[PDB]
Symmetry: C3
Subunit: 334 residues, 3 copies
């Protein structure tokens, strides 16, 4: 019995965009890291207009929470589908090896639970998502996806092999929704999931999202829920998109070090303006803030950002650097 001799540590997850506490450099040997998530089907208002969908969530949020482990830890997930839900669900970890990432082993009807263990053999950020046979994109595009970060045991490294240490981390999950439209263009609503299914499929088959949002709704990462930092702070932004390409961009900043396809054995790309995270991937960008003020963090299809919802904000405190940027002559009459 190898695994029974290992330490167990129980993690208590937090709601995105926050991330549960962890240590970048592993302070122990390999562990069995225990997580519990409870599936919740719930109504969610996703825009300023009040559009309401039936979301399918891990742990009550879109995205599901970020799990964090180290390479060669074991992830042990207790997945609970309470009897107050209506549908069968499961979970596929892109971090895992075998059984469709776990999906073949985790099919839970309402009123059931299961516990899956897998060894996190590859370092990176990875998508996880529900994937019930025959209804995969419906569950994913109903919000039933999140991410897991598998840190190298010795933490992150730059392109030269020197340490990169973040002061803060955020998890931005980006969700494409396909709210069914009638022939005048208004959303339709449905009375049961079975009654909704064919028009969900029809809406998905357009390949044209109605909404593309961060943290589950238009504007979710703004106002009192803007992301925060201070000048000089090193920030890692993990970004996932389980179904569709995105192109993140920090307006007024950069990705100083970017793993666009999320896998830490590779050297990061330096000095990115914008990067492509393919659908079905998590990526990660590291930035050291150099200026205070408001930033926007967007998918840089600017229609997707500013019309469909894929935009959030940072509020950054600290001192303005006029060497880096200044208004020499403020806007005024010619």
């Amino acid at each position: 019995v190898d695994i029974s001799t290992l330490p167990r540590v129980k993690v208590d997850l937090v709601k995105p965009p926050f991330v549960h506490a962890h240590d970048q450099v592993a302070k122990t040997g390999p562990r069995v890291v225990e997580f519990t998530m409870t599936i919740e089907e719930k109504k969610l208002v996703i825009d300023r207009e009040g559009t309401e969908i039936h979301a399918m969530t891990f742990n009550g949020s879109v995205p599901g929470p970020l799990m964090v482990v180290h390479e060669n830890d074991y992830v042990e997930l207790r997945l609970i589908n309470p009897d107050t839900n209506t549908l069968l669900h499961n979970i596929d970890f892109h971090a895992a090896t075998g059984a469709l990432g776990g999906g073949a082993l985790t099919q839970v009807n309402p009123g059931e639970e299961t516990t899956l263990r897998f060894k996190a053999t590859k370092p990176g950020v990875f998508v996880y998502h529900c994937a019930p046979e025959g209804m995969v994109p419906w569950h994913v595009t109903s919000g039933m996806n999140g991410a897991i970060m598998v840190l190298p045991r010795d933490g992150l490294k730059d392109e030269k092999g020197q340490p990169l240490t973040y002061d803060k981390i955020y998890y931005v999950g980006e969700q494409d929704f396909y709210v069914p439209k009638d022939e005048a263009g208004n959303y339709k609503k449905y009375e049961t999931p079975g009654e909704a299914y064919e028009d969900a499929v029809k809406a998905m088959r357009t390949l044209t999202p109605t909404h593309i949002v961060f943290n589950g709704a238009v504007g979710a990462l703004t106002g009192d829920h803007a992301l925060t930092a201070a000048v000089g702070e090193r920030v890692l932004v993990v970004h996932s998109q389980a179904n569709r390409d995105t192109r993140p961009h920090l307006i007024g900043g950069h990705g100083d070090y970017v793993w666009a396809t999320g896998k830490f054995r590779n050297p990061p790309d330096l000095d990115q303006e914008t990067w492509l995270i393919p659908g079905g991937t998590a990526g990660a960008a590291f930035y050291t803030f150099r200026q205070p003020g408001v930033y926007a963090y967007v998918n840089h299809n600017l229609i997707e950002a500013f019309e469909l919802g894929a935009a959030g904000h940072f509020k950054v405190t600290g001192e303005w650097n006029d060497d880096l940027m200044t208004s020499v002559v403020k806007p005024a009459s010619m």
Copy 2:
């Protein structure tokens, strides 16, 4: 006369997803590698519903067959357009240099043939496709595309310069089709290619495929035609998309080493969950299987995969590794 002094070797092509026999490390000096392909316009049923299109093929298949040579070999292609076809065709090799990849030199009316030679000066997997002036996307999106692999003379190498040797290779060609739709959404059929052309153009201009398939049809790489491997086997999957981006993903596995844009002088990306193959590119992923069972291989726009057709299967034999993954508690009642 340099080239006439070189060995000639005739290759007999095989139908995708299989690949003609070759040697990873070159066992001879440079050669003139002789290929023959016969263009075939044919009706193809592309989905479970019986939707039938007029496909334009190299060698009778969608995709066309994978050609394999080594760097600095010469590729000599005899391209035959029999008089039983109706259209002019040609061929552009992305591996080649000059004359629009060969397209300017290979225009063949029905009843004609031609022979093109080019030097394969750059190692990688590359798209080839038909490209007749003024009707390029129509031919490509009618299936008239494949790929060529130009191996380094000393075979594949990892990011550290150590050998990577595959045990098996498969070629997955992914095809976006644009079957014209009437205003209720049913497909239209046509009586001649000229009568079809304007509505093909209209359908293409939507930028929304009706079908996205592997090996020419929904489900083609499933059932008795699933891809196969054994635990411990090293597999190279070449994947091409001549017209539109894709994002391959092995469900339950990874791309251990990935040349997402297909060019072997570059170090591979390690440990990919998903990778972006741009339209107009071939990529290649190397994986060593670690678990038995069924895998799905998909474009990870899961709508494209599970609703539009971009999904195939592996059946993998061998021993299950409970250290890598296990069900600790099988699904059961709370």
Copy 3:
């Protein structure tokens, strides 16, 4: 006063695809490089059919001109919005740090000007674009975007750290337009920008461009305005797309060295057939021509290229190399 002690140099911009004169290796220490651009709202015919839009331009062109500086120069832009325009405009440089890339500091009503300075701290090609709060994608997709190249002080380097020196440089700006369509599919025209705004938003929300063009119009980089080179010449092609992914490809050639996401501290990708430039990015490809004749340079979604406009030409002079490619048997009767 550090900056007032630096040399000032005034640059006179040129119209794309040409690029103002500069030195690859910096011949001076850091400078304040002075640019002036005058915003022009103007009617533009964008296709062969005569479709006319109201373009929003920097300096009268779509794209705006390419600015060129070196790392750690200061860019000082005088941005003029004459009173003959109707709208508020600004500028965001992806090369810059702070204040939304400058956009927060550069809001100019008609009849106003402003001068912004920023330090070009990161080497690469970068997008710049207008971004007025609440109307960002409308301005960008009306053509109000260009690029800036920040060269390393010691010029470009290959993957091994050896110099790469271009003989010629071109700037291809690729623009997605969303011309509003009525229910039969014809374009609509508008009488004022305010009257156009809602249907511009509706057209953009389809995520389906009506036109995708190089240098502002279908065919702009063809005929007397084809790009030119000679066999043996080293050419850098800078390519930007401020809003939507593209996949450039030189038909009959390659990208010998490609910074697909545009940032020169990273080693280039070698031997690319096609590469993905994410929306919101500039990329750069270096190629040494080896064959004469006509080439096409395209977005390799071939529908986007040949039906929607994303195609230009090179005319290359010099000697044909039959070792690289030859017609062994010209097209003729079977």
